[PDB]
Design a protein around this ligand. Sequence first.
Ligand SMILES: N[C@@H](CCC(=O)N[C@@H](CS)C(=O)NCC(=O)O)C(=O)O
Ligand SMILES: [Cl-]
Ligand SMILES: [Fe+3]
Length: 350
Amino acid sequence: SHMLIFRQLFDQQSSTYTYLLADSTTREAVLIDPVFEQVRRDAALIEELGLHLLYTIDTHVHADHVTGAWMLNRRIGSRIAISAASGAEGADRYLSHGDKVEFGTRYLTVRATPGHTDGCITLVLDNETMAFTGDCLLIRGTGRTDFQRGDAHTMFRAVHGQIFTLPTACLLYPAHDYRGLTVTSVGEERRFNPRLGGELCEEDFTGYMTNLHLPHPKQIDVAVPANLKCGLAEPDWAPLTCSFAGIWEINAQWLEENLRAVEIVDVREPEEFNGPLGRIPAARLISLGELAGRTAELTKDRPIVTVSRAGGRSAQATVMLRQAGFERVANLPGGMLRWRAEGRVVENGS
Ligand SMILES: N[C@@H](CCC(=O)N[C@@H](CS)C(=O)NCC(=O)O)C(=O)O
Ligand SMILES: [Cl-]
Ligand SMILES: [Fe+3]
């Protein structure tokens, strides 16, 4: 009913595109092809957008990366969805041709598009302005057809029957690109795809694919068994969360209840430290511009929380401390301003 929230995310290691969709009317969301290494990033992004993740959806059983479907299920309670035809065990919902994956007022429709694997699906947005083609159709290309259940004939018929029948202007988002491309469309691939577009026939395409010899994915021996189980098999010195920017944040309530358990490093200027906002009791003053050169005064025996006026300069303090070998470091988000606004203890205030 209202605007669609859409985010394309890239995993540099496997060149995988993850896709986040959500209805802004209800903030309910789905996530297509989440990457295991990217679980903290993806979950942080969902949190910062105020979203509720109903489903992870895997287009097929991947050979190049372990999916995040299980880790996200465990951590934020999202449901695992994958095709029935893929044969993976441990999912909450098996998908078949014509299934409708709802999120709020919006939905995706499932189209079976095997060829790369016999479980590949393509997800079509309700208004058919975009679709997610997994490794079936790629940007000016296709998925490989040469391992296990791969079949070039099946892929050709899938692309022509299920994808080239979408609207001409419909955008197509693939699970991978290796040249820095992000999207294509039905019209472009139908006309310019060099393997099965234009006037190429089924025989032309299969002859191409039977002579395409690509190295196996680097993670193949690890990923496919892991993904047949939907991705089955973390600082704990304080309750920590990692922001989308990548900064480790401490829970302020826990910090006030355990100030003796940590070293508190105030990176403000000397005037701010003795100034009207006050300081957190027992806070060590090492101004940010002095911090890098004085890291030998802090002990690795005890974790370190950085504080500044509003949490900005202290976030940068965490990066400097990590680059100097410190591991148990965290930022106090919102800084002295939020500490005071939440009525927490300060010395020398006003
Ligand atoms: N070198 C890549 C593997 C490249 C590859 O084979 N990607 C697959 C996706 S599972 C494909 O089907 N086609 C690649 C292409 O057509 O260039 C990696 O280690 O991840
Ligand atoms: Cl600040
Ligand atoms: Fe694949």
